[PDB]
Amino acid sequence: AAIVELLKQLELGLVPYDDIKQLIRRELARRLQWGYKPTYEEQIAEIQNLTHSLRQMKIATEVETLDSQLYEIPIEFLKIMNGSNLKGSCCYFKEDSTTLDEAEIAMLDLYCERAQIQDGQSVLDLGCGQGALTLHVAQKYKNCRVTAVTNSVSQKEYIEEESRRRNLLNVEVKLADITTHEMAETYDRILVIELFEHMKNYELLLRKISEWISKDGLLFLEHICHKTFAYHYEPLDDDDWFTEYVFPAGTMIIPSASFFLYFQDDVSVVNHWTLSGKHFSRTNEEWLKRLDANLDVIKPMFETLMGNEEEAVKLINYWRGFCLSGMEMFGYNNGEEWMASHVLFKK
Amino acid sequence: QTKKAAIVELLKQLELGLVPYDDIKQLIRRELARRLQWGYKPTYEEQIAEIQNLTHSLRQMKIATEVETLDSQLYEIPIEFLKIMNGSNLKGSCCYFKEDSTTLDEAEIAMLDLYCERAQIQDGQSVLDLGCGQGALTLHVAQKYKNCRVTAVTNSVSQKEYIEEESRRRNLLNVEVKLADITTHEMAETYDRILVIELFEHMKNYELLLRKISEWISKDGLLFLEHICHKTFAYHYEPLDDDDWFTEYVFPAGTMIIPSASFFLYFQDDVSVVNHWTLSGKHFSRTNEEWLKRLDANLDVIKPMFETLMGNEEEAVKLINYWRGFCLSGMEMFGYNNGEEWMASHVLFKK
Ligand SMILES: Nc1ncnc2c1ncn2[C@@H]1O[C@H](CSCC[C@H](N)C(=O)O)[C@@H](O)[C@H]1O
Ligand SMILES: Nc1ncnc2c1ncn2[C@@H]1O[C@H](CSCC[C@H](N)C(=O)O)[C@@H](O)[C@H]1O
Ligand SMILES: COc1cc2c(cc1OC)C[N@@H+](C)CC2
Ligand SMILES: COc1cc2c(cc1OC)C[N@@H+](C)CC2
């Protein structure tokens, strides 16, 4: 009700950044109050309830209404906001000199390091995005056989096209929905960068993925998380505007750092890392600098995409919201609440 | 320099029973505080990396070290002493106090019931009790699941003693007891439910131990585990520094590990976690406290017993204050910060 006018102000870009950030922190602080429990017994039971609950769901509900609101994004826009590698996920900022572009590379190298990728292997990039990791792995290891899987077509066409121009003869893009796709091939490395947040039955999904791992192969998983608790992105109450601010409810789950430790039926954990929230926070902060600095080019292309001025404005302030959501959320408490998690699995 | 010698004087005062209970609790809390400080990390990244350093280093060890010198200093205790210090079932592990007026006996019973609930024992099952102690669980499960066939495993000639005798004395078919080093025991038998109550703390290489135990699980069988823990970090029970007198006060060096509550989540190569609970440190705190009350109230019968077992009053004194420090260590460690630091973890595994 009284949030209906806040959402409207945010749409019209009336609320300045300082004010936005503080209103967001208020919402985060309320989420921590909600998520943290007085006794560790309860805290653990809340993870046990969510794990058991997801085990009676389908691999992912509402699969490509997610992929037409987001992910079917103009390439030309993502080239403005994202870095050169078009990484649509956490980047890694070692030092403060670290630009967005280096931060992209740093994170991608770390993946290859931590997934233990060697020149002649089959490599599978599930939820490939704009192909940042696929192209990286292809340029880096000439004899690797990379297969990037997406359900989008704007993504598929770009990666295919980009391979050709970068002259990467070892990339293969496969258009499919992973929730229902079955493939009889098998791979030495499987890589999943921030896909699981959109899915539900991690048991069925990891059972499905476990079979695409050849013997002695490995599955590498990045997911954002909270340090301690886990939850569906669903409003706390009548006053929570932040949860559905950017992601439409039902599209998102925020795992605990330990979450997929509870899903080791068909894969077994080998290694586990986490990584400060300040990394994704700066990533978002550089995505935001990128919008605001290129408004002059963004407005006219938004203005033609939405044949309209009623709405070119709402879409630009949507993307600010995205950025400021990630900036403050993962930034919260010097990066020690919401953060990223890296898990390495064998069969 | 003199702080090394200050410590050794403290240790002998404790052996001689010259330090009042409150002074002991105060000093223990100071070490505890310092372990928390050494344990917690300023970034979560460093915290998780610490768990990985330990999970990985254990995988290169053997299943257990100091095995028979653990069965000698501890776990070969005269039963006559245990019936005084422990409650009716001689449970030498965490009991469950739901209400402020829960007795020790009641509390033993409540934990034992909770094990059967969480391991989902059912009247027609084959049950293996690894590291059975004085068989508090074996006898309990045996009793009113008459068509179970409980099997207890111990490397302690004194523990095989008491169970076999007290199991025919209560007119029980089911109970069978085997004397074996679990570190080296192989067996071609196979069980619907394997219960492990506070055994792993003495082990090292958990990947090798759990590989072995899973081979003893029947199809659709379960593994139920209890281990004490700290909620966040894990560690070998080795001294922080030279001023740490508490870490080796009770348990011999290199015989104990304190896992994180999350620890065995990382040892799932041959088993698979189905459920996971923790349980407030107030239960084991209160348990150790009820044990301590039972000592002091029966010094009249414990003193001659310890004289008879030792050869001289000097060592009988040292021994009774040993057991006091056992229970005091337990009280303060697990009751620390209202029981939300050191505590008990329950894990249910399938094959
Ligand atoms: N059900 C599904 N089937 C196939 N691909 C999916 C999918 N759901 C989401 N995706 C893809 O997975 C990606 C998750 S966002 C991650 C982007 C990319 N992995 C990167 O690192 O930059 C989206 O870009 C989308 O293309
Ligand atoms: N290496 C080893 N092999 C077999 N048993 C061992 C062992 N190390 C310790 N134990 C046994 O494991 C138990 C740990 S104390 C727990 C006692 C019992 N489970 C109870 O709850 O009452 C003791 O009985 C000890 O004798
Ligand atoms: C900006 O906030 C978020 C950004 C992203 C994610 C989650 C965010 O906040 C929870 C998920 N990744 C899959 C895509 C990027
Ligand atoms: C009293 O402190 C402890 C008691 C016991 C344990 C650990 C204790 O302190 C860490 C372990 N169980 C195996 C045996 C009982």
Numbering used by the authors:
A (entry chain B): 11 to 357
B (entry chain A): 7 to 357
Q: Could you share sentences copied from the article?
A:
In this paper we describe the first crystal structure of CNMT, an essential enzyme in the core pathway to BIAs, which introduces the amino methyl functionality that is often essential for the bioactivity of most of the medically important BIAs. Previous studies with CNMT from Coptis japonica showed that this S‐adenosyl‐l‐methionine (AdoMet) dependent enzyme can N‐methylate a number of natural THIQ, exhibiting highest activity with coclaurine 4 and heliamine 8.8 To further characterize this enzyme, the C. japonica CNMT was overproduced in E. coli. The CNMT structure reveals a typical class I methyltransferase α/β Rossmann fold forming the AdoMet‐binding domain, which is capped by a predominantly alpha helical BIA substrate recognition domain. CNMT forms a dimeric interface made up of 13 hydrogen bonds and 3 salt bridges, similar to that seen in the PavNMT structure.
CNMT consists of a relatively smaller, more compact, active site (CNMT 387 Å2/PavNMT 1081 Å2) which is shaped by positioning an extended loop (residues 249–260) and residues 64–82 of helix α4 closer to the substrate binding pocket. Three active site residues, E204, E207 and H208 are in close proximity to the methyl group of the product 8 a in the CNMT structure. Given that the E207 carboxyl is 7 Å from H208 imidazole, which is in turn 5 Å from the N atom of 8 a in the CNMT structure, H208 and E207 may function as a catalytic diad. Moreover, the backbone carbonyl group of T261 is within H‐bonding distance of H208, which could similarly assist H208 in functioning as a general base. The close proximity of E204 carboxyl to the N atom of 8 a (4 Å) suggest that E204 may interact electrostatically with the substrate/product ammonium ion. The proximity of the residues Y328, W329, R330, G331, and F332 to 8 a also indicates these residues may be involved in substrate binding. The fact that F332 is closer to the product 8 a, in the CNMT structure, than W329, would also support this hypothesis. The CNMT structure indicates that larger substituents at C3 or C4 would clash with E204, E207, H208, and I234 residues of the CNMT active site. The structure of CNMT with 9 is very similar to the N‐methylheliamine 8 a structure except the two ligands are flipped relative to one another in the active site, with the carbonyl group of 9 in the same position as the amino group of 8 a.
